[PDB]
Curated annotation (Swiss-Prot), chain A:
SUPFAM superfamilies the UniProt entry points to: Ribosomal protein L1 (SSF56808)
PANTHER family linked to this entry: 54S RIBOSOMAL PROTEIN L1, MITOCHONDRIAL (PTHR36427), LARGE RIBOSOMAL SUBUNIT PROTEIN UL1M (PTHR36427:SF3)
Modified residues (N6-succinyllysine): 104, 153, 185, 196
Record has RNA-binding as a keyword: yes
Annotated protein name in UniProt: Large ribosomal subunit protein uL1
Subunit description: Part of the 50S ribosomal subunit. Cross-links to the P and E site tRNAs.
Keywords: Repressor, Ribonucleoprotein, Ribosomal protein, RNA-binding, rRNA-binding, Translation regulation, tRNA-binding
Gene Ontology cellular-component terms listed: cytoplasm; cytosol; cytosolic large ribosomal subunit
Cited InterPro entries: Ribosom_uL1_bac-type (IPR005878), Ribosomal_uL1 (IPR002143), Ribosomal_uL1-like (IPR023674), Ribosomal_uL1/biogenesis (IPR028364), Ribosomal_uL1_3-a/b-sand (IPR016095), Ribosomal_uL1_CS (IPR023673)
Domain of life, per lineage: Bacteria
Record-level Gene Ontology MF annotations: rRNA binding; structural constituent of ribosome; tRNA binding
Listed Pfam families: Ribosomal_L1
Curated annotation (Swiss-Prot), chain B:
Residues recorded as bearing N6-succinyllysine in the entry: 71, 83, 112
Modified residues (N6-acetyllysine): 89
Pfam families: Ribosomal_L9_C, Ribosomal_L9_N
Superkingdom as given in the UniProt entry: Bacteria
An annotated Gene Ontology molecular function: structural constituent of ribosome
Name this polypeptide is given: Large ribosomal subunit protein bL9
From Swiss-Prot, chain C:
Stored Pfam families: Ribosomal_L28 (PF00830)
Keyword Plastid: no
GO biological process, one term: ribosomal large subunit assembly
One Gene Ontology cellular component: cytosol
Record Gene3D superfamilies: Ribosomal protein L28/L24
Organism placement in taxonomy: Bacteria, Pseudomonadati, Pseudomonadota, Gammaproteobacteria, Enterobacterales
Protein name (record): Large ribosomal subunit protein bL28
Keyword annotations from UniProtKB, A to Z: Ribonucleoprotein, Ribosomal protein, RNA-binding, rRNA-binding
From Swiss-Prot, chain D:
Protein name, per record: Large ribosomal subunit protein bL33
GO MF terms, alphabetically ordered: structural constituent of ribosome; tRNA binding
Misc: Surface exposed on the 50S subunit.
Gene: rpmG
NCBIfam families assigned: PRK00595.1, rpmG_bact
GO cellular component, one term: cytoplasm
Protein's organism: Escherichia coli (strain K12)
Highest taxon above the source species: Bacteria
Coiled-coil region list: none
Keywords: Methylation, Ribonucleoprotein, Ribosomal protein, RNA-binding, tRNA-binding
Similarity comment text for this entry: Belongs to the bacterial ribosomal protein bL33 family.
A single GO BP: response to antibiotic
HAMAP family the UniProt entry points to: Ribosomal_bL33
Length: 223, 149, 77, 50
RNA sequence: CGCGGGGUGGAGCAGCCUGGUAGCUCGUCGGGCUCAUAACCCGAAGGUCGUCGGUUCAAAUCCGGCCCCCGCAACCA
RNA sequence: CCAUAGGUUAAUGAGGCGAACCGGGGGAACUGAAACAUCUAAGUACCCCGAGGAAAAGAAAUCAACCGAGAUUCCCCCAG
RNA sequence: GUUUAUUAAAAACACAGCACUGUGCAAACACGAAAGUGGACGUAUACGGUGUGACGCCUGCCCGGUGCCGGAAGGUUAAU
RNA sequence: UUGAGCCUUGAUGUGUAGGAUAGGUGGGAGGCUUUGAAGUGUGGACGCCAGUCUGCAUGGAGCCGACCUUGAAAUACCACCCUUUAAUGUUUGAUGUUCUAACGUUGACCCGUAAUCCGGGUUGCGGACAGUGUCUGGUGGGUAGUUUGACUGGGGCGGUC
RNA sequence: AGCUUGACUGCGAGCGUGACGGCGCGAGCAGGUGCGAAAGCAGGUCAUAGUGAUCCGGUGGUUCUGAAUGGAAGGGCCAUC
């Protein structure tokens, strides 16, 4: 090193080897920020469980007080009066066959798409344009249900979605560095207990190999 | 290895100074000979006292053991013939008093079996290690000198 | 006797055991090698056979304390 | 023992498992078989053999 | 009592990370070639890439199980 | 040289014969387990060695249990 | 020539010559709680050891299976 | 001199098609360059010939998506994750050289002693090689103890418990 | 063919058998669910072969035990390989 001036002035506040206690650093997390974009604190977990076998692949989503670090714009594909119930619960766009032409042609202004089972006949024709975005609803993960009003509300309330990468590693954001550091020790447990309930059916003995926590292009914190 | 010095090893450091040395070089030489101690301030005055009770067996011969050096040790330059030529090379010597005498123009008698040669026998006019006992484990250097042809 | 000449630690018998379970007497012999020392009293140097823990008494008390009690047990060094 | 025995828990998961002679080696089928939970002394649905 | 690989016209093997896609050598039925016979070369004919689950618009292929094969394998009283 | 290897002899002590017991050092196998192999035979048998009227052992870094006993040994039990 | 004492006296064993694999000298080889001594007061034209079998003139094929030497390309892989 | 390992540094991605070397994967519109590219030429270099890096004449804040089109799918501006390897720094080994405050001498000489045993004494030569013992894995009849079921109108092929 | 899981839990008078270990069959009671409109019926298969006593340690509950005693290790029960 060789290091950029934006971070060289933050090493004027922090040690290069110490990982700081999240119960003691509660005034320091807001103080190491330097970027022209919003910096975060993200959790890095090592697995496992088998590093190759896809039967032990981990997937899911967990609800948090700040979700992904922002609110989401939710769209709902539903016919008749059940669509007005989702519009009053958390949807900002109601979808129908007239909207399935626009999504296929290329234009979409929403973070999450939910559908009801008799409306899912239309959305089934969008599976290849919604696929590479992770935007496609699927009954086998609950993103298709008759109670669409509760399903749009589950997304609007703020949730984070995950799956493990190659050789068994998984990374997820748990707050902005400017957000209340007092709650990091509380929200980390709500993330961990939910990820621990997501253990595979054929998992045996162990599940976590190592846990680490760091800031965007910045220092690590200790638990 | 952090140690404190107890001897005149001025090429390694000063007396009573704290220096870093290798653990093997300490264990094989500086520790067993009474020249250095591990740098633990509360345990060194004891290791010094342990050396004083072993000094009390020859302290009187560090004071007086040479009739010609009664209060302080002397350095002397040789006065006996170097038994060489202009090439500075010779067959050497076999006589245990044929060398190292520094008062040759005088009625002073050279000591029997008290000479010590730390590097080997003098086979050249070159400057080399040469000493005479005052006691069985206590020695004084003398400076080799080119004399006669 | 092949001993550490300052402590008198000697070869002896017992049971060593095989790689698995079974008895083996085999005769025991402690590790031993030569080392040179100044003695003061003979005004010369000597070679003596010394080993484990016995060389450590010389480490704890010095060569003037340990070697001065030798040459009484019919000692041939 | 060439039978690879399975053990399921009740609807409520409480107490011990129910060990069963139901096979998994030869055919993929429904594992629910409705059995007795002695904490309630009632016939209930049984779940998850892992 | 375990693990790795394999199941493909008549025999023995591909593979992977171009998922929109059955390749091959050897034989057989026929030519090139040849005075034939050898050496080399390439047309033609014939098969559910086993089997039960799974993801999907889609798998012989990948992901889970089974079974028969081909190579390696270990222990308490 | 100092010293040490080495050489005398003054005084004392040892040495050899021992009857069993006693302590120390070495140390099996046949046999037993109805196999044989950890285990057993056994620290027996025997070889090597010293000493008393006997020898061993001894004056708690013991043994207990919130209560205490107060160096060691010999016998009857605890307990097959 | 040697020979199986009292049931085969030899086609058995032995010296010759040939081949090969080791061995630079404190050799390789050998007996030993390990010195030491034998190899040898020898020096690869010497010595160890296993074959075959004096002499004359000669000695075809197979390295897949067994052992041995170097590697472990590729597999399986201990201790700590 | 280098084996393995850890940090630092720098770049990995072209099945295939064109404008095009779509890494994975999740975000995202104003963000980045003032020895800095543009663009046609005399040059250097890797190349999958597309692209990129450097130099000079120069000109000097662009440029880009969205627009426009290509495709299931995007293409400014960015976390997070991962390759193969050298040097700067360094953890731990190996081979070789050299010095010798550990240890060897099948080196000599002197004294015991006009003693081709041996110690001591003096001086040369070797040297962390060797040597001797020790523990764990491997190997290993050279040596020591032991095992190797029963029926079968006998043995043996076959039958059998 | 419809519904369905009695391929039941805890107890059991006993009945048949071999020298014994051990093997085979079980009225019926209690708990609960299932079929049938109901009287009534279900502890598998049309019956008989389809499998190793124990010592060991592992696995999941309990709080019976647990060397000074409050925890713990280890064992016992309960549930199993």
């Amino acid at each position: 090193a060789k290091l950029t001036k934006r971070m060289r002035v933050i090493r004027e506040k922090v040690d290069a080897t110490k990982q700081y206690d999240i119960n003691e650093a509660i005034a320091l997390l807001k103080e190491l920020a330097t970027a022209k974009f919003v910096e975060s604190v993200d959790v890095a977990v090592n697995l496992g469980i088998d590093a190759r076998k896809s039967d032990q692949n981990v997937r899911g989503a967990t609800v948090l007080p700040h979700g992904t670090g922002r609110s989401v714009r939710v769209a709902v594909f539903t016919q008749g009066a059940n669509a007005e119930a989702a519009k009053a619960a958390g949807a900002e766009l109601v979808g129908m066959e007239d909207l399935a032409d626009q999504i296929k042609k290329g234009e979409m202004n929403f973070d999450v798409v939910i559908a009801s089972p008799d409306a899912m006949r239309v959305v089934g024709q969008l599976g290849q344009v919604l696929g590479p975005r992770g935007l496609m609803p699927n009954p086998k993960v609950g993103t298709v249900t008759p109670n669409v009003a509760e399903a749009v509300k589950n997304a609007k309330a703020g949730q984070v979605r995950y799956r493990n990468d190659k050789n068994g590693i998984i990374h997820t954001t748990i707050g902005k560095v400017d957000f209340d550091a007092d709650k990091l020790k509380e929200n980390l447990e709500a993330l961990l207990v939910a990820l621990k309930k997501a253990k595979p059916t054929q998992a045996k003995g162990v599940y976590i190999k190592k846990v680490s926590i760091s800031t965007t292009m910045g220092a690590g914190v200790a638990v | 290895m952090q140690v404190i010095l107890l001897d005149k090893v001025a090429n390694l450091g000063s007396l009573g100074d704290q220096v870093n040395v290798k653990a093997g070089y300490a264990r094989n030489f500086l520790v067993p000979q009474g020249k250095a101690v591990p740098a633990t301030k509360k345990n060194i005055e004891f290791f010094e006292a342990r050396r004083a009770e072993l000094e009390a067996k020859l302290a009187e011969v560090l004071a007086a053991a040479n009739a010609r050096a009664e209060k302080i040790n002397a350095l002397e330059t040789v006065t006996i013939a170097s038994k060489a030529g202009d090439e500075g090379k010779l067959f050497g010597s076999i006589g245990t008093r044929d060398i190292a005498d520094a008062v040759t123009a005088a009625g002073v008698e050279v000591a029997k079996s008290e000479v010590r040669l730390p590097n080997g026998v003098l086979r050249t006019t070159g400057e080399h290690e040469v000493s005479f006992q005052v006691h069985s484990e206590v020695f004084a250097k003398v400076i080799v000198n080119v004399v006669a042809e | 006797s092949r001993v550490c000449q300052v402590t008198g630690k000697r070869p002896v018998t017992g049971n060593n055991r095989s790689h698995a379970l079974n008895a083996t007497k085999r005769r025991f012999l402690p590790n031993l090698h030569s080392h040179r020392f100044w003695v003061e009293s003979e005004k010369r140097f000597v070679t003596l056979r010394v080993s484990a823990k016995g060389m450590r008494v010389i480490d704890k008390k010095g060569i003037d304390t340990v070697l001065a009690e030798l040459r009484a047990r019919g000692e041939k060094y | 023992g060439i039978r690879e025995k399975i053990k399921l828990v009740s609807s409520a998961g409480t107490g011990h498992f129910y060990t069963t002679t139901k096979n998994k080696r030869t055919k993929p089928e429904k594992l629910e078989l409705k059995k007795f939970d002695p904490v309630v002394r009632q016939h209930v649905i049984y779940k998850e053999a892992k």
